[PDB]
Design a protein around this ligand. Structure first.
Ligand SMILES: *[C@@H]1O[C@H](CO)[C@@H](O)[C@H](O)[C@H]1NC(C)=O
Lengths: 463, 5
């Protein structure tokens, strides 16, 4: 009603989804009224580098099973291909090769074809294309026009969706204006927003894109994807910061999910609710209903708590806000003779985190198997805060100098080990707090050695 | 930093 295409694009780098996960995702999609899937995993060689090579029968049979499942689930299956690393745009033989590659899909009932040119060189690679075209946009437009014209003479109502080589940031770029002029209007055009993974997508922004393209764009929305340098981040937070009236300027939205499919269901649930009724969408309401349905009511408050340490994404790029504020508050308490209050706050927070871990660790489902590395490092950060508690308590009492010194040793050791953490759970917020415990307790080492009388800042003797 | 960058 609001969006014609309400989709998932499997378009990420990293380990492609398993055949069974795709089939399962199609059931999740139907449950939440998502009606469109694009096959485009970057690490499938036959999608991209070896785009000329046809799929073997074993693979084509799996595609047939996917296509039939999609149809039974009310999902339009789109097969995408990415030829732009080596395509000779002007070559008649190359067109024939692409048509040969997609023919098995045409014969299995797929009428929607993706042809993507993201992440390729910004200028023409081949001399024969430089002789035929003034620039990339012209070559691509002519190629896509010719592919469409061929498909109209092959099947009934073919549809092409293309991804431009410039797919984010400046909507008034010359390339985009050439593409809007020269692409036939019914070829759909992808766009990811102001950034690759966009913080916000506004109506104003998509209005501009619409003008240059001379058509409503289709959004390739890069959330919850956590590929490449984002792999350490667990993107489980709600879909957010997409204007309630984007539907006016956008024909549809495909979400690029994580290589963790079960974990993706949490934000994808919220994404689907936004698409269903964007004017009544509340991300916190949606996220809580998502957690209840998918993971169970009894894990809700534990998930709420655990999510506070997994906020980092394009949607919430800052260091985790709750813990950032809390440790600043605790440090002010210590700096203002409110020792009991600061220690209490730290104590209560540790208990909350232990309870949260213990609760979620008890659950056996696939979701909790996928997010286990984040749970493990979450517990570790909690163990370290517990030792910070001991260190501060013994600092304020003073004999307990031994327990304080011992805590400094422990913290020094684990802060070094924490350099090797694989995830971005708790950001660097717990790290920086623990490092400051180390800095805040320098003078007890000086006191231990009777060096206070001659040690100068930063806490050394010199001449 | 995304893989696409
Ligand atoms: C570039 O960005 C994302 C995130 O790294 C990646 O998954 C995707 O395949 C690339 N292309 C587009 C159009 O987003």
């Amino acid at each position: 009603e609001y969006f014609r295409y309400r989709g998932i694009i499997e378009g990420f780098y990293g380990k492609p989804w398993e055949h069974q996960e795709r089939l399962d995702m199609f059931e999740f999609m139907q449950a939440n009224n998502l009606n469109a899937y694009i096959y485009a995993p970057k690490q499938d060689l036959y999608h991209r580098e070896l785009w000329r090579e046809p799929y073997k029968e074993e693979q084509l049979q799996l595609f047939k099973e996917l296509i039939e499942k999609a149809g039974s689930c009310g999902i339009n299956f789109t097969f995408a291909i990415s030829p732009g690393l080596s395509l000779v745009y002007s070559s008649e033989e190359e067109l024939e090769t692409l048509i040969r590659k997609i023919t098995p899909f045409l014969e299995m009932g797929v009428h929607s074809i993706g042809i993507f040119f993201d992440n390729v060189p910004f200028d023409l690679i081949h001399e024969e294309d430089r002789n035929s075209y003034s620039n990339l946009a012209e070559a691509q437009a002519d190629f896509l026009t010719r592919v469409l014209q061929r498909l109209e003479s092959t099947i009934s109502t073919p549809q092409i969706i293309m991804c431009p080589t410039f797919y984010c940031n400046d909507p008034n770029l010359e390339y985009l204006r050439i593409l809007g002029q020269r692409l036939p209007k019914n070829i759909d055009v992808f766009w990811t927003g102001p950034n690759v993974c966009s913080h916000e997508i506004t109506t104003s922004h998509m209005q501009e894109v619409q003008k240059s393209l001379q058509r409503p764009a289709t959004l390739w929305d890069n959330y919850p994807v956590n590929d490449g340098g984002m792999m350490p981040e667990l993107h489980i937070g709600p879909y957010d910061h997409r204007d309630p009236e984007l539907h006016t300027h956008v024909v549809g939205i495909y979400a690029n999910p994580m290589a963790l499919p079960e974990a993706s269901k949490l934000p994808l649930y919220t994404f689907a609710q936004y698409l269903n009724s964007p004017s009544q969408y509340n991300p916190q309401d949606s996220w809580r209903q998502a957690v209840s349905t998918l993971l169970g009511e009894d894990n809700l408050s534990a998930m709420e708590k655990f999510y506070q340490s997994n906020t980092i994404s394009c949607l919430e790029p800052e260091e985790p806000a709750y813990l950032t504020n809390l440790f600043k508050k605790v440090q002010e308490d210590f700096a203002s003779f409110r020792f009991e209050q600061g220690l209490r706050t730290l104590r209560e927070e540790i208990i909350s985190m232990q309870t949260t871990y213990s609760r979620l660790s008890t659950q056996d489902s696939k979701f909790f198997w996928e997010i286990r590395p984040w749970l493990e490092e979450y517990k570790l950060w909690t163990d370290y805060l517990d030792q910070a508690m001991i260190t501060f308590s013994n600092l304020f009492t003073g004999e307990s100098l031994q327990k304080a010194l011992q805590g400094r040793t422990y913290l020094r050791e684990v802060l070094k080990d924490a350099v090797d953490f694989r995830t971005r759970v708790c950001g660097d917020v717990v790290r920086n707090f623990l490092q400051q415990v180390l800095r805040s307790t320098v003078s007890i080492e000086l006191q231990a050695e009777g060096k206070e009388w001659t040690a100068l800042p930063p806490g050394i003797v010199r001449d | 930093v995304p893989y696409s960058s």
